[PDB]
RNA sequence: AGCAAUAGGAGCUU
């Protein structure tokens, strides 16, 4: 869905030069401040109040590759974040990625 | 069903109940600009595409 | 599982009370020395199984990508369970599966 | 076809599905037409073939050049022997026949 | 992928139990291969114990350092290599003659155990344990990490002189130790072959090296049904063995000859 | 137990040594050729069963054919030593005994290692020749292997004939190292040429010649 | 006939999968249980085709 | 232009004739500008069954030799080994990982305070020879503050967050080493980024405009000596940005 | 009776 499975040069450039799929799009980037504010509202607790002796079940939250906190219940946070993105409050090109085993 | 001409859409029998979250808008959109000119690209071996 | 110091908060190492022949645990920073319970001092494993059932969470029922099976919960008679194989990824690992009830949340197996 | 996604080949399959369709079995014929999944798997295989053709030819050409340079000076002489440019014998009779 | 092809003696070559006994003789096992988990217990008094399983055993074994090593031996793993407690304890004493004193539980015991005593020593015990687990051999030829029971469809003449197939057990291995396997009784010492022709050169000479080299090249070419005439591969292997040693097809081989400078520079 | 296996391996090595001597041209009595494991154990081992290797040490004389052919073929001494490691001391005794009874060639079969310090005395003991082999290497006779064709050292006149037939110089021949297992087994000295007849799938039979480095 | 043969091979593969999952598959020398499972499935599907 | 993503930890296996077995590599960049700053690996020395010390040693930027991990954890301001382990170990009950963690603790038992460890880092900072302790400390503290995970933060007084990210990286390293988690996929397309006209022109413009500001400095060194008022319209050589952008866009060579 | 070089990039057939 991201790059065409068929269009690639022959020869020594094979597989290194790719071609975008028709519905592909490249993100422009977006400020991370509203994301952090939404996260802070819904219940994320900071790392200055973190103690892995107690927090054995908590789910850790990364933002742009930066670990910024942990949550007691990722389910409602991902649901609300997805609803905010699908309502327009968050930029539509913002990834909201829950990992469940990790 | 039982159409000897139309291609068999895969059985998918292992899973009791599917919980889909998304659908492709159209599967031909995986191709790019140059591959989109090809008529019936699913009837060719990929090197020819 | 090695403990830590009740005063200096470092970790205690083994030692011998040659005048009593009892395994103590010595702090290399402070002078505190407490009595221990277990005379084991070392372990080594080659046939391990840590990571068999550990790959489970409370909300593992919320994963919509896991295949759902019809196995009966021996516990809770549930006719709906998501399932997966051993999450250890070694070459010689088994291929037996694990079964999680979405009703009772007990993990089980087919044996 | 490897599990390029986490525990699956494509995001249209479920986790830990080892069935033939999940791991690259194409049930249709070219006449009947491939499904999108079969099309993508066949594209991966054809791409592997193209990469192999593109990449092994350099090793093969290097090998053949080295063989030619190693054997370039070897000739059958009028006494039947097989000698190099130094006159050293490689075989006392060519092909042993 | 190093590999030997060990042809068996004919009496062994037809029987399967004998072939499996030869397999057991040729395969390499270390204490790692039969060890589950090693412990360390502080046992201040040699004649007594703080443990509750082996107290009866050591009271039946009697009528130095207080540091003890308690390694455990799984049942089926011990079972599969035809190994019992006696040979293992003997082998431990073989290299720890008098700088170590070995106790071993019996084979029928509900727990298969070994106990050792040293004659601050909580780290020399760890070093000794590592050296034992990583260097004690039990049986077989070092360098042979796996052995397979393979079948070869040899064609031999009948008693009427007519060629008839004949179904014999032979051996394939992983790893290479040609000299020691050729000596093992029950092996056809005149037919053992290796797929590493450097080993052949070190063991059998340069003509056998040429034969092995031709066999490998023929295998590589004829794998896919291609047929190259004999004389070309014969020439290639004769150039590679003409000096008495293996001359590689590289700059390190070609440019070490005595030919003119312009040829070597042109390459 | 392990003693029977040790004795059997030693007997196999002794048979290989005798096969070496007979192949090299020396006369060996037909009865000592067919030496069997039990009779060897009778004549060599002890009450405790461990073997005295100082009785195995024999003396071999050249067969008259290998004198008419190899005029430079003298008298052989073969010693199985008892010290696993061998030092300059034992090598000094061996060389003294070899020069003491004008033995042309002395084969010194050892067990474990010959230390480089001791090894340096091997070539400096002219005009006698001292070669050494390890017992583990001699367990299998490699000239009986199917991949090892039969090597036959040429005589001086035949080497000259070979060089003249091909209008050759010595350096233009295929070569064999003096440390080659079959050159070592044959006692090849520098300049001597073996003739190697071998199987040929295109012609049936093919004769090869290699010169010793 | 062709679709019956393909369905039979799919059933055979499903049986191999069941045998591997309930730990009853017979391994081969120098080959892992997972590699044995994969080799048997590949054999089955190549013979199906 | 296709490039691996930034500010993500990836853990790779290594090769047989290599003392290093497992390597966690992260490249760092800032939310403003989206430019690379520094890279910092945490390698696992010790092969399977060989290389008896299975320690983990970091590689800070601007230092020549690789520092052990407990040393930098102490240098960042958490001395007690219990707290170090807790930053590494979220679950005390797990035992195999704790059994694989002892050689690090032993190889870094010498240090017991922040100053000595931070000097130990400083003694390797690749600077000039013979700096005294009080400013070797300042140099090393500057390295630990800036050029160490700038994406986390570059201001002082927030070392705990950097310690937590280090604990996470070490934990992922051990998960990959203890086979409890699979190695990261190099070819996964989700761990890659595409640089379009925006970021490419941003990089080139940053280079050329720093060139221009250096020119402004190299003019204000001389002209101010004359002690005259200047109108700045002879101080900017406008041809620098124009020639640079035109050269790069006309040749394709992206750089000076 | 006289038609520069060096680079980079995109391609052709194996
Ligand atoms: Zn303490
Ligand atoms: Zn239930």
UniProtKB/TrEMBL annotation, chain A:
<comment type="similarity">
    <text>Belongs to the RNA polymerase beta chain family.</text>
</comment>
<protein>
    <recommendedName>
        <fullName>DNA-directed RNA polymerase subunit beta</fullName>
    </recommendedName>
</protein>
<feature type="domain" description="RNA polymerase Rpb2">
    <location>
        <begin position="61"/>
        <end position="102"/>
    </location>
</feature>
<comment type="function">
    <text>DNA-dependent RNA polymerase catalyzes the transcription of DNA into RNA using the four ribonucleoside triphosphates as substrates.</text>
</comment>
<comment type="subunit">
    <text>Component of the RNA polymerase II (Pol II) complex consisting of 12 subunits.</text>
</comment>
Automatic annotation (TrEMBL), chain C:
<feature type="binding site">
    <location>
        <position position="101"/>
    </location>
    <ligand>
        <name>Zn(2+) 10</name>
    </ligand>
</feature>
<keyword id="KW-0862">Zinc</keyword>
<feature type="binding site">
    <location>
        <position position="104"/>
    </location>
    <ligand>
        <name>Zn(2+) 12</name>
    </ligand>
</feature>
<dbReference type="GO" id="GO:0005730">
    <property type="term" value="C:nucleolus"/>
</dbReference>
<dbReference type="GO" id="GO:0003676">
    <property type="term" value="F:nucleic acid binding"/>
</dbReference>
<feature type="disulfide bond">
    <location>
        <begin position="73"/>
        <end position="76"/>
    </location>
</feature>
<dbReference type="InterPro" id="IPR012164">
    <property type="entry name" value="Rpa12/Rpb9/Rpc10/TFS"/>
</dbReference>
<dbReference type="GO" id="GO:0006283">
    <property type="term" value="P:transcription-coupled nucleotide-excision repair"/>
</dbReference>
<feature type="binding site">
    <location>
        <position position="76"/>
    </location>
    <ligand>
        <name>Zn(2+) 12</name>
    </ligand>
</feature>
<feature type="binding site">
    <location>
        <position position="76"/>
    </location>
    <ligand>
        <name>Zn(2+) 8</name>
    </ligand>
</feature>
<keyword id="KW-0479">Metal-binding</keyword>
<feature type="binding site">
    <location>
        <position position="8"/>
    </location>
    <ligand>
        <name>Zn(2+) 2</name>
    </ligand>
</feature>
UniProtKB/TrEMBL annotation, chain D:
<protein>
    <recommendedName>
        <fullName>DNA-directed RNA polymerase subunit</fullName>
    </recommendedName>
</protein>
<comment type="function">
    <text>DNA-dependent RNA polymerase catalyzes the transcription of DNA into RNA using the four ribonucleoside triphosphates as substrates.</text>
</comment>
<comment type="similarity">
    <text>Belongs to the RNA polymerase beta' chain family.</text>
</comment>
Automatic annotation (TrEMBL), chain F:
<keyword id="KW-0804">Transcription</keyword>
<dbReference type="GO" id="GO:0006363">
    <property type="term" value="P:termination of RNA polymerase I transcription"/>
</dbReference>
<dbReference type="GO" id="GO:0006384">
    <property type="term" value="P:transcription initiation at RNA polymerase III promoter"/>
</dbReference>
<dbReference type="Pfam" id="PF01191">
    <property type="entry name" value="RNA_pol_Rpb5_C"/>
</dbReference>
<dbReference type="GO" id="GO:0006368">
    <property type="term" value="P:transcription elongation by RNA polymerase II"/>
</dbReference>
<feature type="domain" description="RNA polymerase subunit H/Rpb5 C-terminal">
    <location>
        <begin position="140"/>
        <end position="212"/>
    </location>
</feature>
<dbReference type="InterPro" id="IPR035913">
    <property type="entry name" value="RPB5-like_sf"/>
</dbReference>
<dbReference type="GO" id="GO:0006361">
    <property type="term" value="P:transcription initiation at RNA polymerase I promoter"/>
</dbReference>
<dbReference type="GO" id="GO:0003899">
    <property type="term" value="F:DNA-directed RNA polymerase activity"/>
</dbReference>
<dbReference type="InterPro" id="IPR005571">
    <property type="entry name" value="RNA_pol_Rpb5_N"/>
</dbReference>
<dbReference type="GO" id="GO:0042797">
    <property type="term" value="P:tRNA transcription by RNA polymerase III"/>
</dbReference>
<dbReference type="GO" id="GO:0006367">
    <property type="term" value="P:transcription initiation at RNA polymerase II promoter"/>
</dbReference>
